[PDB]
Design an enzyme around this catalytic site. Structure first.
Site, short mmCIF file in Angstrom:
data_model
loop_
_atom_site.label_atom_id
_atom_site.label_comp_id
_atom_site.label_asym_id
_atom_site.label_seq_id
_atom_site.Cartn_x
_atom_site.Cartn_y
_atom_site.Cartn_z
N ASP A 35 0.84 -1.20 0.00
CA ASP A 35 0.00 0.00 0.00
C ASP A 35 0.87 1.25 0.00
OD1 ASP A 35 -1.91 1.91 0.28
OD2 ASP A 35 -2.44 1.40 2.36
N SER A 199 -0.56 15.66 -11.98
CA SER A 199 -0.77 15.32 -13.37
C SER A 199 -1.01 16.58 -14.19
CB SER A 199 -1.97 14.37 -13.48
OG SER A 199 -2.34 14.14 -14.82
#
Length: 330
Positions: A35, A199
């Protein structure tokens, strides 16, 4: 040193991935959920409330000659999906794919919430976010990667998750045969303890690319792709009959649909998520309403590049003094 381990989807939807991990002496092998959005290595154990164990493999520290109680240490964690676990702490030897760390904090669960009990395939979590998020008190503990880093040939790990197929976690090296083209690296903020990056935009299907900054986290422990409501609405508007359902808890679409791809920007590069990766199947067995793999982050407080996005790429988690993330097509 290096390590290399195969990671395998737990079910036919790629809801999560499990990777075998050797703990203790002699080794006890547990299948952990790696994770990158949390920083605790915790396991089902001989200390876990019996009624909360249902098929998981347990770590028994009393059978490990290298286990030592970390005296006074406790841990307690809550995840974004509302699940939680807590317990005490041992140090022990932990190996992943041939890479060994001695003295790793192994957090032994005394209590786990129902969603963990109900998932017999996940024996615990192995956190790979920054150690500043580790929940052990009163002495915070380091992640497996943080403990291994100095010994690694290069201070990196990579995630190569498969679509409906096994993939690989590598530690300490970049397998140049595992991706196509070049790796595009992008800056990371560690201020919230995550692999947080920006992004450069998105496209839906064959549509034009929209240049817009989207701050979010690379999170292998989250199944889906959670993005701003504007972006998610633009995606689902291209699917006839798709709608946001408050009763189901997100966007659903007709199971008869063919989904468009979704592209996200990494600097000037582009990662394309095929439409099929966004199909999470019937909302309930036999339903013709299917659950979408791109969902709004509006109720979370952060955008999450979960498995739906990451499995479309070869992803480098660069733990150099200034961390960065790398993405390549594959």
């Amino acid at each position: 040193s290096t390590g290399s381990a195969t990671t395998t989807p737990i079910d036919s939807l790629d809801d999560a991935y499990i990777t075998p991990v050797q703990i203790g002496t002699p080794a006890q092998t547990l299948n952990l959920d790696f994770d990158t959005g949390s920083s605790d290595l915790w396991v089902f154990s001989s200390e876990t409330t019996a009624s909360e164990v249902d098929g998981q493999t347990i770590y028994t520290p009393s059978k490990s000659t290298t286990a030592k109680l970390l005296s006074g240490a406790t841990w307690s964690i809550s995840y974004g999906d509302g699940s939680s676990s807590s317990g005490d702490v041992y140090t022990d030897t932990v190996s992943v794919g041939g890479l060994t760390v001695t003295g790793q904090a192994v957090e032994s669960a005394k209590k786990v919430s129902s969603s963990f009990t109900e998932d017999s395939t996940i024996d615990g979590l192995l956190g790979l976010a920054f150690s500043t998020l580790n929940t052990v008190s009163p002495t915070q503990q380091k992640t497996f990667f943080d403990n291994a880093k100095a010994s690694l040939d290069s201070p990196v790990f990579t995630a190569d998750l498969g679509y409906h197929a096994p993939g690989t976690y590598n530690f300490g090296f970049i397998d140049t045969t595992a991706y196509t083209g070049s790796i595009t690296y992008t800056a990371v903020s560690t201020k919230q303890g995550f692999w947080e990056w920006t992004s450069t935009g998105y496209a839906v299907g064959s549509g034009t690319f929209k240049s817009t900054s989207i701050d979010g986290i690379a999170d292998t422990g989250t199944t889906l792709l959670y993005l701003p409501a504007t972006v998610v609405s633009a995606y689902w508007a291209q699917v006839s009959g798709a709608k946001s359902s408050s009763s189901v808890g997100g966007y659903v679409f007709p199971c008869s649909a063919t989904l468009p791809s979704f592209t996200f920007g990494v600097g000037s590069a582009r990662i394309v998520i095929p439409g099929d990766y966004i199909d999470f199947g019937p909302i309930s067995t036999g339903s013709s309403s299917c659950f979408g793999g791109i969902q709004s982050s509006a109720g979370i407080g952060i955008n999450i590049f979960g498995d739906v996005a990451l499995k479309a790429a070869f992803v480098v988690f660069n733990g150099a003094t200034t961390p960065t993330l790398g993405f390549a097509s594959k």
